Write a protein that binds this ligand. Sequence first.
Ligand SMILES: Nc1ncnc2c1ncn2[C@@H]1O[C@H](COP(=O)(O)O)[C@@H](OP(=O)(O)O)[C@H]1O
Length: 370
Amino acid sequence: DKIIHLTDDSFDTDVLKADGAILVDFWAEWCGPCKMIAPILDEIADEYQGKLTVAKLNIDQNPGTAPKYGIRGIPTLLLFKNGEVAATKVGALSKGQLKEFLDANLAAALVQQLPKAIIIGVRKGGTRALLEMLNLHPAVVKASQEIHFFDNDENYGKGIEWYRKKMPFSYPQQITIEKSPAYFITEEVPERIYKMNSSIKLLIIVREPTTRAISDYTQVLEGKERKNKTYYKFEKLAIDPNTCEVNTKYKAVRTSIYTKHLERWLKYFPIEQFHVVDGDRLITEPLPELQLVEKFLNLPPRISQYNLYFNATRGFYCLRFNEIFNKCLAGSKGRIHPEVDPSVITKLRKFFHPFNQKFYQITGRTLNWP
Ligand SMILES: Nc1ncnc2c1ncn2[C@@H]1O[C@H](COP(=O)(O)O)[C@@H](OP(=O)(O)O)[C@H]1O
């Protein structure tokens, strides 16, 4: 239910310490009009998702708050804009009367905003899955395609205004998020993002290093199988034949060394502006990982178990927004990996181990890979 039921205990957290526009309805079971506008409020919460949050406060069970604002009779509607009464309305009113009161008081013009958080990587970590799942939140709009702005000198030269006009439209209250997995490893990107928005928030979703490398390789092989071209076995690319050790020049191994790349980014951004998503837990138990991202982005908790249903035939979780809109990810997500010689997997696990430890230390998240 899109409506938020308040208590006197949780009014500071949910309205005053909150951000965005919130309409609070003060009501009680003995107020006829209050029960006559309850259906209207239900339709408003749905037609104004994005630009307004509708909340109720039952003054019978919560007698503390209403006096603090001069609430004489009920119903009384208080529109808060970022913990500050911006408007009031007293006594019942029609759905069209409420729409006139809101529309003439909400800054709800559709706008193209620069992203306030960027998923900077990693390739095959679950970037698409992370983006689509965060979009489940009513405050988040996703950039549908990968934009590739800071990692492409042709695009970067077109100005930050070009980047902005690539973004989707949104109510100014929402936040926009973009995904471009190449940003993580491209050298010039951290300083360019920093110039744009030195306080931007950066998301990194990682998987088990060896597994991410094989997933990487598998994507390249599909695109080569399709074109009827020859490639090589993962074992031949990942192991140097002269030493039988890990070949550090292989791009898919280089990209799983998450800590060498992160340290380039820490030259410019503090660790407090990063959040690391456990891409493995996103595959098997995603909801807790999404709740951490909600708090990282200073968003209220709106993603629930209802929004994630497991698809047994697919082997992955799928998304459910409302009662009728359902979505699984594209066909290229969830490829079966080739079987890889166990000895090589052991050599890679032993190879990544010290880099994993350094990664846990810097980020403060221990992901329990080998
Ligand atoms: N709900 C989901 N559906 C499909 N793949 C998902 C998923 N949640 C996470 N993933 C993972 O994200 C990978 C794709 O990442 P990206 O979008 O960054 O390329 C998938 O690659 P695999 O084919 O290796 O399983 C899979 O491991």
